[PDB]
Ligand binder design. Structure first.
Ligand SMILES: [Zn+2]
Ligand SMILES: [Zn+2]
Ligand SMILES: [Zn+2]
Lengths: 201, 104, 610, 100, 169, 295, 284, 59, 57, 47
DNA sequence: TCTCATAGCCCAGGAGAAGGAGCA
DNA sequence: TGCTCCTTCTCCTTCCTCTCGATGGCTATGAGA
RNA sequence: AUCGAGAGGA
């Protein structure tokens, strides 16, 4: 069936939302809220504190951790609610009844929680401070949170490299504040994630 | 404990979107990040790739380095290893198997 | 097994299907058409049977995953056959569909309304309405009223299934039980009994020719009667596999509305339309090399038989491709010559052999043979059928770990529900005791004692799954581990787990004794441990001798040592001897006392016993 | 996104509308040997991998004996989910089963 | 128990360079505790699993490879046959036949039988101070089960016992 | 997959039902056989009362439904314990077939309750020596015991039944006291349950006779029912060929007429008619077949 | 004679008679001329499904195979140019191989300091004072590269670079990177390489490196190679080296009076003593 | 990491991602510090505070 | 070839030499004890084809 | 005769519901009869 | 210039199916 | 026109331990004396 | 280590 494959190519890899610039003045609103559901285990050694146990065993080890199914980096979780597998509970009860696998004391269950995901897409606007200086790239400081890489050939000839070296704006004064650049691709190369930056491409 | 757990108890990589345990494999850990198991049945070739756009999530390379795309819905189940043997032996007669794996 | 390694997912139900040729060309590892099996006496050739794309072969790496033999499962290749082959596993079934079709109109020689009625019957059987599947024949009275009757039957089946879908008599995935499947198989068997009797075509009066098979090998066609040829003309010998493919492809393309119903015992939810390539072998899969390794001892090599089969398949394939190149030589024109008469026949005879070779690959029985030696190398059918097959040799009957075997000996000094353990079995059978704060001092005692003095500690396993052995370490290397079982949370990824010890056996455990020819559930019972010094055998009480049918002239008892607290509780409660005092057959006991106790009871309770 | 929500609601439908009311639970109120053995083994497996303490340890090195001691006073927080050939399941807690 | 191990180094026309003894090479010195300098063991030596039996030098890896005793029981060396080729010594020594010897104490669990089919298993070797003693002074060698006689119907063991006591007097 | 479901009905593991109760009465064989010796249970009324304490279990179960229902069925099936079951216009179901047998106190089988009341009425001499033991207290004890002696939901009773047929079958293949008729031992048993064969080795039928029929009348019937072959009355067959083309004369010497007349109830004109009807016809057909099979 | 076997058959059996009569119904002619041209049309449909055969002459001989030889010049009829030195040694590495300080310095201590690998090789002492002409100095450089291959061969289990840099006398980087890029299985990944890189050599490339070593020794021994003293030197197996020279086209033969005249070895003890020689063509 | 003990198996969303502005995210920053009051993970807390100092005017 | 015949026992011929079974004509002497050793010269065998048949006649 | 019943199973496309004990051990799951006929579930606190 | 002397490889146990040999 | 009884094939199955072997033949190359 | 063949034990 030739009609299935075109949509399965273009729609499933197509993302959910696009970030607009606030009044064309600030930056994008790439910090977005999304409700998720998952299915995780729970240790008996934190059974007295089961919600914070689930937090410290699946969610607090998910802090600043990238997933492509969420598309970005989580800046914190909110609203942990366990979907109890026992009916007639009405979401106001304390005797939640989680299913136990018949080999281990780590009980798996469903949980809804919100995520605050940072995800950039193709053709977006971000900004960065002065973080490092080099001869052909400057890794920009993304929201004082991440690092941005710049390939050399995307730099026009109007930029003035001086010489350790430094980049000089077309205004001629040394740069300061938050420099604007365009997102082309997202990468995970390094200890944390990075981004592919551009200015004319 | 006896007839399964003490003889040939094994994990298994499954792609849930195809529902098989054999065609999945390990990707070559390239210079960017750690390796990740992937699905050869749910794989997009670089030959055509409906180009008569792919985001940098599912591009991975085999041992010679050909670019495949797909097969991320991966989970590990508990099987005997002789089940993997029987899966590889039933295809010799031309039989597909399909294993429903919840949580879907 | 590990109880510190929980499995999140699970197998819930099993579905079937058939892979086709282009899907294997999409997914599989590498096209392998190289008969080079031994490239200068010590090497795997690339693109051949031992290519590193198929995993790893005797301390080589992988050309697909690039990992070790203990990380790669081995990958599945694919032979591209020259011609499309049958699948023998389905063979006779499609042979029936070889003889039920009208060759001209591409329908079945039975009446079309009759096959429509069978299709509506099987559609009603898809949803558990056998009542409707016998009330369907109630709807009776050119082809205008025949189409009206077809629409009557269709509306009847649709309204019955809509009424079934009104209430919860059938869910969305369908209704299917034992009686449903029995009625379905009766109607499919009657259907195939009816699709072999109609000589003429019931659509246009034609005559399809007579066919006859060799069983797995060939199809022979017979010329029809002159009266039949006369009836065909006024109103209208070896055959190849591609002719069978083209005929059955056009039949399946014209008969989708009924063979969507015949070959599906449920509501086909994903709309899997049946095609001819579901029965056919244009490709063969190639197993991983890991499941095909020759047996090696030092230098001695027993080469696998499936390597011989698949190498003969590749050799025959390249011989057929070379004869295809010779036919490419003849097709310039070469028409004024009978020189291409022989090699073409040398094509066709070889065109037999590959079929035989596929009949020699999967089957080993039904084929031809180079006789007078009678050595059938195992096809994949014969590796699945018996006790020496797979379902009994490796699926059910498994030689286990952490077990023991001995001759036994009497002991009337321990109790009835107890077993005597010799020290030679008390050193080579361990229990995975975890680390917990109540039994921390006993485990430190076992760590100080070690693997040479009962009881003790042998293998301290860290939270990464990494092991630390004590089988050759010194005394002080053991004693320094005493303060090294209370490690805090170093890595938060594995912080919830603790350490483990494969400690020796002691009195607070339970084993499972068994005597190997069993006949009932009381031939295999749990027993509470007592370790005996200066002992060679297992020690038994006499009350067990009724249940195990034991005589002490050289018995052979097995002892499974269980590996979970769940199994400890089940052996201690659900299968202990205390709960097996009576037969489940009639109600008699099988336990008690034996002849010395009996004669002593005769003499002791007598009235001359002061 | 929305089809996942629909499948989620169908899952919660087939969970909820296959449940059994507390008025309908009419099995035996006893506890069979299988049920008691599974409760003991599973609770001891939890305690061996650090379940929270709710009974006195009495210096016993056997976790199965600690599980039987804890069963002796009905302290255990577990519920047996009894399944039926339909799949409609009742829930019998420890507090509403006659142990032995 | 007597066992036999045929250590050969000639399983593969000239190039066999595996030579018995020691080449000019380093090796852990405690092999002569169990061996001799000619690549052979001291005859009549305590052999336990984890000890070399035949050692030989080869220049193909500049290595003296050994042959470790692989059996469960502790053993002793009985006779070391040294076999040469039937033709006129075209190669040097290449085949060593070794006879192991293993002690077997009469143990518990052993199978002893009489001459009437009544086999059995020695369950415990009973102390002589715990034995029943006769008026003449002696204690028996083997106490046997008396209940085996009705079912098996071995009345001839009475006859052999009585005639043997008659011959013993 | 043949086990005890929670409704105490024998099903397969998918719900395919086989029986509605385990043996009809849900009594496990493991705790069975002390439902026949009631005098011993009266002798240990104190011990079985101290064991099965009804005080810590009355707070969870209804007690006064199955007792009344069982007394109604008891009065009805003592009222009509003489008609046959086809003439018995059937009333409502028996006791177990209504209630949960392990919830209501008094939900018992019919034969156990009948033998219980027969024991309680047969021993009127005995209970005068008792301390006050009646039908009621002893009945409540035996009903608590009957509730505690029911089978667990989830026992592998297909496996238990298979092993309890297999294990005494290994005491077999003995040529037993067979000649003083049917196939015996394992060759019978495997013929029954596994193979399901219609070609029985010795198929038989046992017909009861009335009381007015004497032994001579019944043996006259036995000589009436019996199958009679032609060769049973043939002494000599003499074929004399003479080759007029090829021909041959057949002379049959039979036996005396009174012999088979008394033994097989056959006259010589019945012999005439059976030579007339079936013998010469099949003989001629066999001659035609043997002539045709040369070519 | 098949008809005579059938004449014995028709009297002989009833099971083999039926079996071979079924085989004769199976035997009969499976091709006629109209069927021949119809099957020619069906082989044109096989052209339509022509999953093409591999070329089995250049992909299966020149590419990665059992023992990859050095880059051989079959077209060179000169036996000293079957392996030209610009084929074995790349020009990219050859342009920074300078041994003028080796023959310039007279101290053998500093000369063995300037070899990358140090051993008890008798071949180094045999072929250092023997070669006297500076015009063959690049051949001497070839011997240098031979010693450099020893720095790979008996030091291959060093599973990284810097600890393998601890086994050489700090050479220029291009030789070591050319060897580790042409001869090794490059396993990528910077997850561990920032700490410590880990990759090794598959045994097929190890036998390739053995072929390179034996070709370099084939240069410096008048293209007639010794076997048994080389088998003393290589510390490997004899028939292994015989196979490695049968891959490299060297005819490993016994000795005539010419090899007893040249190598100083006795002809009377040359029935088992082997010597590798060369001829013009390439192997099969 | 391949075990299920330290890794969730199924992760999906149910609704469209609503572009919450910096108001609710800043409120989550302040209430997140307050809830954690009521090292790589503390460096995650430090970067989560440098998000606030980033939007302020002096990081 | 005679070493093969005694070391394996497979009678390999063409006419079969007018017998029933085609294997198992060689017995290891087994001189563990002299009773066994003298029993292995009067120990006659009926036929492996009859050991195959389950009929107890 | 595993192959013939497997042929009929594929030509019926049998979704095996996985309730037979021998089937459940060939696949290798916790068997039904006994401590697998039900499930144990955890009673948890709120705080 | 042949004689060795070797490399390199080519007899249960019935039950079903399944279809001919006659019949309304 | 359609529907039965007489011949073939075509199918399938107690537990453990130890030892002892295990392709012929058609052609190249390759010295020895 | 696979297939045969042989032996022995409850
Ligand atoms: Zn997939
Ligand atoms: Zn791989
Ligand atoms: Zn037609």
């Amino acid at each position: 069936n030739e009609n299935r494959e075109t949509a399965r190519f273009i729609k499933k890899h197509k993302k959910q939302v696009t970030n607009p610039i606030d009044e064309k003045n600030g930056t994008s609103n790439c910090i977005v809220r999304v409700p998720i559901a998952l299915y995780v285990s729970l240790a008996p050694m934190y059974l007295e504190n089961p919600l914070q146990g689930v937090m410290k065993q699946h969610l607090n080890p998910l802090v600043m951790k990238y997933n492509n199914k969420v598309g970005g980096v989580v800046l914190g979780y909110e609203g942990l609610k366990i979907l109890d597998a026992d009916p007639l509970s009405k979401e106001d009860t304390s005797e939640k009844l989680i299913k136990i696998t018949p080999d281990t004391p780590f009980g798996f269950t469903w949980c809804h929680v919100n995520l605050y995901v940072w995800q950039p897409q193709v053709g977006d606007v971000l900004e960065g401070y002065i973080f490092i200086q080099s001869a052909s790239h400057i890794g920009l400081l993304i929201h004082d949170a991440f690092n941005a890489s710049i390939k050399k050939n995307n730099i026009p000839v109007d930029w003035t490299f001086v010489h350790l070296g430094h980049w000089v704006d077309s205004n001629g004064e040394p740069i300061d504040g938050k420099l604007r650049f365009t997102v082309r691709n997202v990468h995970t190369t390094g200890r944390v994630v990075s981004v592919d930056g551009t200015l004319i491409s | 404990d006896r007839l399964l757990n003490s003889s040939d108890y094994t994990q298994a990589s499954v792609c849930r979107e195809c529902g098989s345990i054999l065609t999945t494999q390990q990707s070559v850990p390239r210079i960017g990040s750690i390796s990740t198991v992937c699905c050869r049945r749910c794989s997009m070739r670089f030959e055509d790739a409906k180009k008569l756009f792919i985001d940098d999530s599912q591009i991975w390379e085999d041992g010679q380095g050909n670019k495949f795309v797909g097969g991320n819905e991966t989970t590990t189940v508990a099987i005997p290893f002789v089940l993997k043997y029987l899966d590889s032996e039933l295809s010799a007669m031309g039989i597909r198997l399909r294993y429903n794996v919840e949580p879907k | 097994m590990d109880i510190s390694k929980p499995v999140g997912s699970e197998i819930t139900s099993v579905d079937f299907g058939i892979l086709t040729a282009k899907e294997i060309r999409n997914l599989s590892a590498k096209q392998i058409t190289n008969p080079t099996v031994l490239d200068n006496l010590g090497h795997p050739v690339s693109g051949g049977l031992y290519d590193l794309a198929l995993g790893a072969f005797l301390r080589n790496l992988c050309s697909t995953c690039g990992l070790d033999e203990k990380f790669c499962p081995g990958h599945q290749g694919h032979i591209e056959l020259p011609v499309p082959c049958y699948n023998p596993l389905f063979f006779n079934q499609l042979y029936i569909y070889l003889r039920a079709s009208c060759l001209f109109c591409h329908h079945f020689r039975l009446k079309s309304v009759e096959v429509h009625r069978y299709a509506c019957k099987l559609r009603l059987l898809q949803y558990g309405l056998i009542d409707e599947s016998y009330k369907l024949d109630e709807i009776t009275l050119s082809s205008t009223l025949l189409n009206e009757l077809k629409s009557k039957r269709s509306e009847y089946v649709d309204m019955a299934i809509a009424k079934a879908l009104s209430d919860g008599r059938t869910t969305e995935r369908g209704s299917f039980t034992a009686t449903v499947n029995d009625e379905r198989k009766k109607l499919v068997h009657e259907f195939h009994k009816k699709l072999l009797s109609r000589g003429k075509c019931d659509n246009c009066g034609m005559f399809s020719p007579k066919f006859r098979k060799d069983g797995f090998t060939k199809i022979f066609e017979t010329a029809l009667n002159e009266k039949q040829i006369t009836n065909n003309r006024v109103k209208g010998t070896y055959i190849l596999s591609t002719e069978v493919k083209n005929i059955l492809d056009t039949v399946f393309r014209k008969e989708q509305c009924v063979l969507q119903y015949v070959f599906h015992s449920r509501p086909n939810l994903s709309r899997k339309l049946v095609k001819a390539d579901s029965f056919f072998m244009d490709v063969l899969v190639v197993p991983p090399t890991r499941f095909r390794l020759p047996s090696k001892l030092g230098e001695e090599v027993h080469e696998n038989s499936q390597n011989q089969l698949l190498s003969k398949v590749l050799t025959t394939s390249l011989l057929i491709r070379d004869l295809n190149d010779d036919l490419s030589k003849l097709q310039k024109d070469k028409v004024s010559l009978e020189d291409r008469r022989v090699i073409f026949s040398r094509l066709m005879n070889a065109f037999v052999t590959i079929q035989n070779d596929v009949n020699a690959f999967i089957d080993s029985t039904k084929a031809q043979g180079r006789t007078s030696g009678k050595v059938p190398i195992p096809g994949v059918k014969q590796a699945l059928e018996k006790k020496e097959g797979l379902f009994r040799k490796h699926m059910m009957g498994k030689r286990v770990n952490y077990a023991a075997r001995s001759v036994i000996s009497p002991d009337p000094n321990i109790e009835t529900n107890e077993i005597g353990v010799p020290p030679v079995f008390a050193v080579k059978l361990t229990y995975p005791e975890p680390v917990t704060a109540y039994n921390i001092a006993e485990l430190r005692q076992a760590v100080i004692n070690g693997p040479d003095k009962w009881p003790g500690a042998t293998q301290i396993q860290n939270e990464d799954g990494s092991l630390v052995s004590l089988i050759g370490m010194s005394v002080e290397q053991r004693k320094a581990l005493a303060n090294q079982l209370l490690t805090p949370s170093s890595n938060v990824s594995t912080h919830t787990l603790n350490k483990k010890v494969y400690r020796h056996i002691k009195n607070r455990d339970v084993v499972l004794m068994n005597r190997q020819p069993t006949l009932h559930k009381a031939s295999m019972m749990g027993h509470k441990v007592r370790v005996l010094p200066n002992e060679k055998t297992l020690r038994l009480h006499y009350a067990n001798t009724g249940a195990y049918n034991a005589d002490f002239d050289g018995d052979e008892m097995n002892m499974h040592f269980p590996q979970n607290e769940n199994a400890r509780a089940e052996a201690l409660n659900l299968a202990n001897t205390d709960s097996q005092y009576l037969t489940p057959t009639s109600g008699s006991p099988v336990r008690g006392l034996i002849q010395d106790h009996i004669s002593a009871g005769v003499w002791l309770t007598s009235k001359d016993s002061f | 996104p929305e089809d996942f929500q629909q499948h989620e609601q169908i899952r919660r439908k087939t969970l909820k509308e296959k449940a059994i009311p507390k008025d309908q639970r009419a099995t035996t109120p006893y506890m069979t040997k299988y049920e008691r053995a599974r409760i003991l083994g599973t609770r001891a497996l939890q305690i061996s991998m650090n379940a929270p303490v709710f009974v006195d340890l009495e210096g016993e090195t056997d976790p199965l004996r600690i599980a039987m001691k804890e069963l002796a006073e009905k302290k255990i927080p577990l519920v047996i989910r009894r399944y039926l050939p339909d799949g409609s399941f009742e829930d019998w807690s420890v507090e509403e089963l006659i142990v032995d | 128990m007597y066992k036999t191990e045929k250590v050969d180094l000639a399983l593969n026309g000239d190039p066999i360079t595996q030579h018995f003894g020691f080449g000019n090479d380093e090796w852990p010195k405690e092999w002569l505790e169990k061996l001799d300098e000619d690549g052979l063991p001291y005859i009549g030596t305590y052999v336990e699993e984890g000890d070399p039996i035949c050692a030989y030098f080869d220049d193909t890896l500049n290595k003296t490879k050994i042959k470790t005793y692989h059996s469960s029981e502790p053993a002793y060396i009985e006779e070391v046959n040294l076999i040469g080729d039937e033709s006129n010594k075209f190669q040097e020594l290449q085949t060593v036949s070794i006879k192991y010897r293993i002690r077997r104490t009469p143990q518990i669990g052993d199978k002893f039988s009489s001459r009437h089919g009544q086999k059995g298993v020695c369950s415990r070797k009973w102390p002589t101070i715990d034995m029943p003693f006769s008026e003449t002074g002696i204690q028996p060698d083997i106490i046997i089960n008396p209940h085996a006689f009705p079912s098996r119907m071995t009345i001839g063991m009475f006859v052999e016992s009585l005639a043997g006591k008659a011959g013993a007097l | 997959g043949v086990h005890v479901s929670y409704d105490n009905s024998i099903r397969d593991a998918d719900g395919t039902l086989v029986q509605f109760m385990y043996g009809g009465d849900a009594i496990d064989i493991t705790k069975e056989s002390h439902m026949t010796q009631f005098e011993f249970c009266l002798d240990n009324y104190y011990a079985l009362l101290k064991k099965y304490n009804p005080s810590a279990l009355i707070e969870h179960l209804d007690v006064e439904s199955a007792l009344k229902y069982s007394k109604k069925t008891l009065k009805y099936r003592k009222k009509h314990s003489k008609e046959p079951h086809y003439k018995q216009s059937v009333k409502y179901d028996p006791v177990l077939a209504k209630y949960n047998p392990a919830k209501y106190l008094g939900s018992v089988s019919e034969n156990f309750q009948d033998k219980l009341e027969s024991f309680l009425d047969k021993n009127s001499k005995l209970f005068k020596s008792s301390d006050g033991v009646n039908e009621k207290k002893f009945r409540a004890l035996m009903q608590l015991k009957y509730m505690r002696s029911l089978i667990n939901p989830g026992e592998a009773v297909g496996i238990i039944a298979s092993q309890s047929v297999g294990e005494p079958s290994t005491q077999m293949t003995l040529n037993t006291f067979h000649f003083a008729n049917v196939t015996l031992g394992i060759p019978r048993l495997r013929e029954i349950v596994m193979t399901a064969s219609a070609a029985i080795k010795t198929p038989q039928m046992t017909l009861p006779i009335w009381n007015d029929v004497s032994d001579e009348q019944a043996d006259t019937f036995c000589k009436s029912i019996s199958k009679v072959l032609l060769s049973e009355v043939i002494d000599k067959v003499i074929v004399t060929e003479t080759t007029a083309a090829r021909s041959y004369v057949i002379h049959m010497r039979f036996f005396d007429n009174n012999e088979y007349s008394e033994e097989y109830d056959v006259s010589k004109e019945e012999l005439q008619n059976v030579i007339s009807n079936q013998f010469i016809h099949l003989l001629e057909a066999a001659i035609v077949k043997e002539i045709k099979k040369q070519k | 004679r098949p008809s005579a076997l059938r004449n014995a058959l028709g009297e002989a059996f009833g099971t083999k008679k039926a079996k071979k009569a079924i085989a004769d119904l199976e035997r009969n002619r499976i091709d006629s001329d109209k069927l021949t041209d119809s099957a020619i049309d069906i082989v044109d449909s096989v052209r339509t499904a022509s999953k093409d055969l591999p070329t089995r002459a250049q992909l299966d001989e020149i590419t990665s195979n059992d023992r990859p030889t050095p880059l051989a010049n079959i077209d060179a009829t000169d036996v000293e140019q079957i392996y030209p030195i610009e084929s074995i040694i790349p020009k990219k590495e050859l342009q920074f191989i300078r041994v003028s300080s080796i023959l310039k310095e007279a101290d053998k201590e500093k000369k063995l300091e300037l070899f990358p690998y140090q051993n008890n090789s008798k071949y180094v002492a045999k072929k250092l004072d023997s070669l006297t002409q500076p015009s063959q100095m690049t051949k001497l450089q070839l011997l240098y590269y031979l010693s450099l291959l020893l720095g790979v061969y008996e030091n291959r289990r060093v599973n990284n670079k810097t600890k393998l840099l601890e086994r050489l006398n700090s050479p220029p980087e291009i030789l070591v990177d050319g060897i580790l890029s042409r001869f090794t299985v490059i396993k990528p990944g910077q997850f561990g390489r920032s700490k410590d890189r880990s990759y090794f050599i598959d045994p097929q490339n190890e036998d390739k490196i053995l072929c390179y070593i034996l070709a370099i020794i084939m240069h410096l021994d008048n293209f007639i190679v010794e076997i048994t003293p080389l088998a003393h030197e290589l510390n490997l197996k004899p028939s292994k080296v015989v196979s490695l020279f049968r891959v490299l086209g060297a005819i490993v033969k016994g000795a005539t009076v010419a090899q007893a005249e040249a190598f100083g070895i006795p002809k009377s003890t040359a029935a088992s003593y082997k010597i590798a020689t060369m001829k013009v063509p390439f192997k099969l | 990491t391949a075990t299920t003990l330290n890794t969730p198996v199924v992760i999906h969303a149910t609704q469209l991602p609503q572009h919450v502005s910096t108001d609710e995210v800043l409120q989550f920053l302040e209430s997140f510090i307050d809830e954690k009051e009521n090292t790589n993970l503390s460096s995650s807390i430090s970067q989560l505070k440098r998000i606030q100092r980033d939007f302020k005017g002096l990081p | 070839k005679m070493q093969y015949f005694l070391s394996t026992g497979n009678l390999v011929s063409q006419s079969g030499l007018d017998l029933q079974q085609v294997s198992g004509y060689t017995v290891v002497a087994e001189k563990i004890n002299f009773y066994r050793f003298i029993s292995h010269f009067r120990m006659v065998h009926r036929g492996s084809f009859f050991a195959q048949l389950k009929t107890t006649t | 005769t595993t192959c013939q019943f497997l042929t009929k199973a594929v030509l019926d496309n049998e979704r095996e519901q996985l309730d037979s004990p021998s089937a459940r051990i060939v696949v290798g799951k916790l068997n039904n009869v006994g401590t697998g006929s039900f499930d144990v579930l955890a009673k948890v606190p709120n705080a």
